[PDB]
Design a protein around this nucleic acid. Structure first.
Ligand SMILES: Nc1ncnc2c1ncn2[C@H]1C[C@H](O)[C@@H](COP(=O)(O)OP(=O)(O)OP(=O)(O)O)O1
Ligand code: SF4
Ligand SMILES: [Ca+2]
Length: 1123
DNA sequence: TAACCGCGTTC
DNA sequence: TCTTGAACGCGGTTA
């Protein structure tokens, strides 16, 4: 059926590609040098691989192959095709009677099967695969993917009919071919992934296409220079609505092509003609913009396509172009009966993203959200441009853009152009290098590299490794539709994750004194530990053995000259040293060190049957993780007893209009069971969820095939590279190479380059840890993720134990800790080496490191020495190191309003430089929140730097508080009408459409309903709507939820504006629309109030300063405490 | 009061 | 058909 339907595309695609100068090259025939040793003496064409897609090709049904797109050495492009049979495996019950399994499949699959061979693969779930026993399978090959699916169609029944009971007939009778089929395997490998992997081909790599196949020209250093072009469209829009593809037209289309810039004008909307101008925001981002003022909306769409057809771009960049730009251009093209596909080769795909054959479509927004490391309230185009490229792009109000078409066009023109310059340069300096480089190791084309989840990226990488060690791939994981425990149905099970702690709140500055009580037995402990830990510091930390220089004494003396003077005066009070320490790449290093991988986790049945179960098991490492389950207090009895009704069908047809318990699929059934089961639990239990913890043990086999571990290490290594250059470049020519009088921002450009790159790998890296819990994961282990976490806790806790005994740790999260230490503590030294240069030694860091190494070091790490003879060599492995952040000027931690309880994961930090070092958690950073608190927070944090003493510090702070108070107490009469509105608004996102919030109450929720009635049905068409709202004063004595009002009315017609304000306050006699009359200042007075107590006041108190802002008082407990 | 829920952060 | 994790904060309701 489909092979013709699917070869339509193939032929269509082939024509389009050819249109763009992608003619299907075929190489000369050669018999001789087949080895890649003499690559020149082999005929063919050298090309840089830019792209690859799955295709069907007729004889030269249809046969599955892969189109590969190249740029030649000469300039201009070409294409080539590898054909390669889709394939998968049948597993077998008893590995004896396999010819019999090959016999019946050969017969049963005559319709679709092409080829059949028995093969062997390693399989890490087989008893002694470590001793060379390989698992046997039948390899099923097809001429195409479609044929392969047909096979999976014909196998599923027997896979299911064999999973169910064989039902006898002669019940007195004192096997069949089919019943030996164990399972099916590697059947869902995306086809192009299959080729890319099997043939070892990767985009970004240089190949010569030859008769024999592809040869990586491993000699060509750097990538080619694809023609990139990045666009942005400007759109007409109603007041207070979103652009619509039916009613609305496209004002402008701005774009760039390798630094040459362009703008296309709809003259029917843009009144004035527009003149060639320039927008060069910084000097490194040149944008000359010649313009094409075009008569019709059509001539605009057609001047667009024509240019793209001319320049022939293999990359087309956009900012969120997938969900706005492209679908707008497409629908407005459908209007005029233009065919975008026929015109530029782009169409939707089965996920609604716009992709083309020849040209990758690189939606920078996907990078931004996945890989930028920016918070959600910075994933905006503006803020990205700010953060990433270091400048402010032209701003323009949305509701203005449609007006500014007529009135002020040159203004809007310059903005449209800015959207593009920010996109093109964002792409080139950040996206292009990352993705294209990443494709050289990941078997995906650039579009999927950019888009796939980071969990998937990990999977791909793990597949190449597993393939290349001939390891059979486990099937995707499947979750039980319900689990139980101690009789109780399970709600959710996980493991105890990270260990977080707030210890002390308040301001801590370098110029303000602090009181310390140094544990005496700790500095005794560390006095003993100084020799090894400093030999350590040189033997590993710099790995430079010992006595590289002489100072090993001129330093081991100087350290004690502070450690001794400390132990006697073990209660001092002076200036602080504010330090963060944080284990670099914790979970990955914890994993590599403990040789942690899903397959490395064995049971009783597993570890026993192993032929290394001899005397002196040095290969079974015992590690503890903490399981946690959430269940109903209903035991076996009640649980079982809630079998209950099973008789309320109540569901739909397509004449059906009737069902039963057992007529609803087990999903729907279990959904209903959810409801009923909740009732009996709370009714008899006095709770609706019990959560208990049990320490589990797990056996981490040290001998297992480390394809997973090794992959993690490889990716960590990949990353440390950039964390090397990042640290290098921080002092390389930023610290000591310039005099600050030589404007070399060049090093400042590199640091953002490498800081971004190193971060961009962070999430993929840690996704090697997360992955083992991902759904539809091929290598699932709760145990492993469990063990990794708890080990992390243990490591950080133990490190706190020491620090609290030797200073005051402020805050602590997972792998990192903040602490002030005494200002006369052994800081950082430079053990000097004879060979000229000097190393770096920070005693606090190296102090912890030795203890890590002397307490959590894998002494069981076995690795395979002699393949043929199965000889493992044990050795000692530990890659866990703390890293210091240098000493900071200040640090502010909020305190809770609840009593004793602190606030974790929020704080502000400042450099001796004076600049804001780090800011965490706060509403200022987060998307939405109350714009008041945000600007307050903006204003406030800096001001913790003013003031001469701790007491006097909170003063300059307290001023700002009162300032901001005098704006609320003054019922915002101190603030301009236009200005105020913004400052008072609170912006929230709904992540789902409004329909899917059935029976919940929230400001976002009702704002949505309100927008809905006011501006219309379309207003909640789709998910992700921003709810901009103020909370009204009336009705008095009514829940907050109810008084959420969209700020849109406050720019809408007065009749409508009244009818709704009156409606929304149950106040029909409402006549006053005064924006300030409706605003419930009393509420907004508490919120700003909470902020003050959180940041300023309760922290003030806990540091024994009298409340500095009495216009908001202590809670009854903070009062009832001072007594 | 305590248990929740949704967002959106920190790890 | 896509699909890393768990610990927190906070405003808000729910029982
Ligand atoms: N994005 C994440 N996904 C899954 N786990 C994460 C993620 N981020 C952090 N973690 C967990 C695993 C990390 O090892 C642990 C420590 O936090 P953090 O220090 O930010 O990561 P890291 O230690 O791996 O980075 P760095 O090496 O830069 O310190 O937090
Ligand atoms: S832990 Fe030791 S005995 Fe158990 S499977 Fe691994 S190598 Fe064999
Ligand atoms: Ca870390």
């Amino acid at each position: 059926a489909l092979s013709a339907q699917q070869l339509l595309n193939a032929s269509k695609i082939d024509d389009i590609d050819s249109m763009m100068g992608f003619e299907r090259y075929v190489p000369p025939q050669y018999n001789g040098r087949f080895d890649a040793k003499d690559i020149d003496q082999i005929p063919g064409r050298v090309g840089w691989l830019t792209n690859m897609h799955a295709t069907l090709v007729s004889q030269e049904q249809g046969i599955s192959g892969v189109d590969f797109y190249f740029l030649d050495e000469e300039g201009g492009s070409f294409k080539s095709t590898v054909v390669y049979d889709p394939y998968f495996f049948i597993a077998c019950n008893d590995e004896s009677r396999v010819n019999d399994v090959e016999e019946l499949v050969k017969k049963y699959l005559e319709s679709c099967l092409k080829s059949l061979q028995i093969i062997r693969k390693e399989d890490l779930t087989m008893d002694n695969h470590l001793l060379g026993l390989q698992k046997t399978l039948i390899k099923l090959s097809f001429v195409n993917s479609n044929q392969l699916f047909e096979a999976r169609k014909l196998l599923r029944p027997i896979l299911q009919d064999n999973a169910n009971n064989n039902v006898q007939r002669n019940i007195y009778n004192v096997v069949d071919a089919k019943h030996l089929i164990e399972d099916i395997r590697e059947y869902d490998v995306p086809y192009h992934v299959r080729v890319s992997i099997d043939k070892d081909i990767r985009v970004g790599k240089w190949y010569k296409v030859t008769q024999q196949g592809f040869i990586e020209d491993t000699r060509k250093i750097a990538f080619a220079d694809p023609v990139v072009m990045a666009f942005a469209i400007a759109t007409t829009k109603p007041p207070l609505k979103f652009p619509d593809s039916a009613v609305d037209q496209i004002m402008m289309i701005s774009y760039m092509i390798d630094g040459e810039g362009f703008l296309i004008t709809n003259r029917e909307i843009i009144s004035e003609d527009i003149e060639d101008f320039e927008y060069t925001p910084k000097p490194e981002y040149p944008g000359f913009f010649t313009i094409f003022n075009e008569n019709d909306e059509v001539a605009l769409l057609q001047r667009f396509f024509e240019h793209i057809r001319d320049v022939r771009p293999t990359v087309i960049s956009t900012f969120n172009g997938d969900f706005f730009d492209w679908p707008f251009i497409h629908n407005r093209s459908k209007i005029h009966g233009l065919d975008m596909f026929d015109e530029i080769g782009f169409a939707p795909d089965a996920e609604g993203e716009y992709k083309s054959s020849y040209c990758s479509h690189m939606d920078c927004f996907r990078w931004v959200k996945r890989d930028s490391y920016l918070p959600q309230g910075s994933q905006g185009l503006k803020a990205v441009t700010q953060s990433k490229l270091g400048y402010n792009p032209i701003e323009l109000d949305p509701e203005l853009m449609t007006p500014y078409a007529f009135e002020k066009p040159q203004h809007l023109s310059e903005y449209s152009v800015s959207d593009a310059v920010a996109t093109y340069y964002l792409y080139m300096k950040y996206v292009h290098p990352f993705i294209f480089s990443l494709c050289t190791i990941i078997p995906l084309n650039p579009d999927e590299t950019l888009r796939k989840g980071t969990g998937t990226l990990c999977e791909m990488l793990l597949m190449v490794q597993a393939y290349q060690h001939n390891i059979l791939l486990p099937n995707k994981h499947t979750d039980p539709i319900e689990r139980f425990y101690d009789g109780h149905l399970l709600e959710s099970e996980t493991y105890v994750g990270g260990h977080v702690e707030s210890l002390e709140a308040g301001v801590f500055r370098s110029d303000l004194k602090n009181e310390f009580k140094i544990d005496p037995s700790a500095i005794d402990e560390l006095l003993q530990e100084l020799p090894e830990a400093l030999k350590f510091s040189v033997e590993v930390e710099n790995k430079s053995s010992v006595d590289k220089v002489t100072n090993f004494e001129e330093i081991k003396n100087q350290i004690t000259q502070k450690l001794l003077e400390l132990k006697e005066n073990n209660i001092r009070n002076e200036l602080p040293l504010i330090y963060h320490v944080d284990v670099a790449s914790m979970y990955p290093n914890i994993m590599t060190t403990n040789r942690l991988q899903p397959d490395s986790i064995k049971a009783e049945r597993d570890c026993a049957s192993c032929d290394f179960n001899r005397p002196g098991k040095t290969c079974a490492r015992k590690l503890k993780w903490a399981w946690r389950g959430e269940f109903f207090p209903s035991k076996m009895d009640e649980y079982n007893m809630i079998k209950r009704a099973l008789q309320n069908e109540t569901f739909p047809n397509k004449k059906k209009k009737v069902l039963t318990f057992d007529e609803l699929s087990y999903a729907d059934q279990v959904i209903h069971i959810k409801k009923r089961l909740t009732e009996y639990s709370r009714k008899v239990y006095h709770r609706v969820k019990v959560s208990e913890i049990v320490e589990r043990e797990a056996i981490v086999c040290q001998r297992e095939n480390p394809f997973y571990v090794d992959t993690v290490k490889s990716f960590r290594d990949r990353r440390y590279e950039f964390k090397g250059l990042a640290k290098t470049w921080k002092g390389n020519l930023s610290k000591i190479d310039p005099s600050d009088k030589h404007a070399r921002d060049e090093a400042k450009k590199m640091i953002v380059l490498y800081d971004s790159l190193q971060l961009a790998h962070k999430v993929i890296l840690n996704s090697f840890y997360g992955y083992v819990m991902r759904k539809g994961s091929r290598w699932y282990s709760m145990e492993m993720a469990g063990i990794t976490c708890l080990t992390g806790a243990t490591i950080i806790q133990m490190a706190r134990a020491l620090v609290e005994r030797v200073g005051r740790p402020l805050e602590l999260d997972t792998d990192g800790i903040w602490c002030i230490l005494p200002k006369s503590f052994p800081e950082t030294y430079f053990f000097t080496l004879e060979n000229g240069k000097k190393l770096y030694l920070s005693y606090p860091c190296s102090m912890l490191n030795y203890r890590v190494h002397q307490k959590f070091t894998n002494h069981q790490y076995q690795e395979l020495k002699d393949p043929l003879n199965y000889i493992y060599e044990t050795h000692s492995e530990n890659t866990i190191f703390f890293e210091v952040d240098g000493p900071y000027k200040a640090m502010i931690l909020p305190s809770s309003k609840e009593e004793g309880k602190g606030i974790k994961k929020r704080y502000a930090v400042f450099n001796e430089d004076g600049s804001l070092a780090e800011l965490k958690g706060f509403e200022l950073k987060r998307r939405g929140e109350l714009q008041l608190i945000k600007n307050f927070q903006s204003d406030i944090f800096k001001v913790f730097l003013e003031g001469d003493t701790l007491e006097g510090c909170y003063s300059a702070v307290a001023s700002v508080c009162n300032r901001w108070l005098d704006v609320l107490d003054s019922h915002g009469l101190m603030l301009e009408d236009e200005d105020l509105v913004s400052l008072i608004c609170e912006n929230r996102s709904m992540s789902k459409t409004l329909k899917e919030y059935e029976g919940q109450k929230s400001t976002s929720i009702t704002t949505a309903r309100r927008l809905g009635d006011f501006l219309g049905e379309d207003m909640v068409k789709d998910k992700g709507l921003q709810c901009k709202y103020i909370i009204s004063s009336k009705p008095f004595n009514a829940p907050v939820t109810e008084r959420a009002i969209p700020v849109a009315i406050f720019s809408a017609d007065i009749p409508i504006k009244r009818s709704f304000l009156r409606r929304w306050t149950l106040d029909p006699s409402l006549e006053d629309l005064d924006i300030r009359t409706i605003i419930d200042w009393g509420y907004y007075r508490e919120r700003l109030g909470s902020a003050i107590q959180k940041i300023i006041t309760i922290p003030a108190a806990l540091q024994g300063v009298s409340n500095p802002v009495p216009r908001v008082e202590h809670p009854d407990w903070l009062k009832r405490k001072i007594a």
